[PDB]
Amino acid sequence: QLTPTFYDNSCPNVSNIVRDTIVNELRSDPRIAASILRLHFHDCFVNGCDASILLDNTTSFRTEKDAFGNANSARGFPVIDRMKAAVESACPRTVSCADLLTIAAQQSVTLAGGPSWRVPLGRRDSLQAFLDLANANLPAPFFTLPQLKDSFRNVGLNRSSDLVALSGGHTFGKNQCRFIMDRLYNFSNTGLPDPTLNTTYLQTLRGLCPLNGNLSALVDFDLRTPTIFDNKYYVNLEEQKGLIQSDQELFSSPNATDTIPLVRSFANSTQTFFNAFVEAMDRMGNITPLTGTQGQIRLNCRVVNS
């Protein structure tokens, strides 16, 4: 069983070291908190939160970093290396990369203005990476609501609250133009923009992402508060201003009978959202963890111990 007090004797300063690293990095890279939270998400959705995503290529297995959902998208790996080294110095061979990333995600959310809580700990590190599994399990922005629900259920998160609350991670961070081009100019081969995208916002996004323009250009997920972790993401959805298809579908999908009330509840109360987010975050963090003597306490998050 994972417990929040796992390192209270072996490495009481772990949370503080992780926080200090992120605070320092945020000065030069204001996007890092968002990036780190996303790394934890992509770790947990592939064989559980086992730091499998942190492993680099080997001749026996490919890295998850080359997955369609990670390639030229996932970032912050050097920052994780930095905090890992700092933690290893303070507490040699004690904190797993899986746990380190979980703490980093939580601290990132709090540093960005989100809720503060102690995450369950005790996870151990994988002995391999899972590229095929990542390509299969990571959801995509073009998923319909049923597909989004399928993706979450596939990894163990059955609740619509899991999906709606965790999607709140898009209250900050960036998204490439490439992922909304269809919504802007030719949605579902209709030759027209996505009708669920606010027409005023449509104009703004078209200006940032012109047809035949730089597909790698970055746009903010939350037009209200781009770098602050708050419930503004849901207020946007209510006005048809969700950035990607998967965002807006939580409120506009024909299958959104169960998600609409959740979106409204989170838009109406920061407390309701924050509570739901912590609850869902801990559930995602409890996905098939290696514990006890299973796996290892990786010394270098990029490679399995030898």
Catalytic residues: 42
Q: Three-state SS for 74?
A: coil
Residue 148 in the binding site for ligand HEM (CB under 6 A): yes
Binding track, positions 91-120, relative to ligand HEM; x by CB under 6 A: ------------------------------
Instruction: Provide the β-strand partners of residue 299.
Output: none
Structure tokens at 115: 């809720």
76: phi then psi, degrees, rounded to nearest 5: 100, 5
Residue 240 in the binding site for ligand HEM (CB under 6 A): no
Residue 87 or 165 having the CB closest to ligand HEM: 165
Residue 149 in the binding site for ligand HEM (CB under 6 A): no
Contact by Cβ (8 Å): 232, 171: yes
Q: How far apart are CA 195 and CA 89, in angstroms?
A: 54
47 binds, among Ca ion, ligand HEM, none (CB under 5 to 8 A by kind): Ca ion
Breaks (C-N over 2.5 A) in the chain follow: none
Going through the chain in order, the beta strands assigned E by DSSP cover 174-176, 218-220
Q: How far apart are CA 233 and CA 243, in angstroms?
A: 9
64 is in an annotated binding site: yes
Cβ neighbours of residue 210 closer than 8 Å, sequence gap 6 or more: none
CA 82 remoteness from chain centre = 20
61 binds, among ligand HEM, Ca ion, none (CB under 5 to 8 A by kind): none
139 is in an annotated binding site: yes
**Which one of 96, 106, 160, 167 is in contact with ligand HEM (CB under 6 A)?**
167
- Rounded to a whole number of angstroms, the distance between the first and last alpha carbons of the chain is 27
Residue 73 or 240 having the CB closest to ligand HEM: 73
Q: How far is the CB of 287 from Ca ion (least distance, A)?
A: 8
Residue 141 in the binding site for ligand HEM (CB under 6 A): yes
Q: How far is the CB of 305 from ligand HEM (least distance, A)?
A: 29
Residue 145 in the binding site for ligand HEM (CB under 6 A): no
Contact by Cβ (8 Å): 233, 168: yes
Residue 283 in the binding site for ligand HEM (CB under 6 A): no
66: phi then psi, degrees, rounded to nearest 5: -100, 15
Q: How far is the CB of 207 from Ca ion (least distance, A)?
A: 21
Report the interface residues with Ca ion, using CB under 5 A.
43, 46-47, 50, 52, 171, 222, 225, 228, 230, 232
Q: Which residues are annotated as a binding site for Ca(2+)?
A: 43, 46, 48, 50, 52, 64, 171, 222, 225, 230
Q: Which residues are annotated as a binding site for heme b?
A: 170
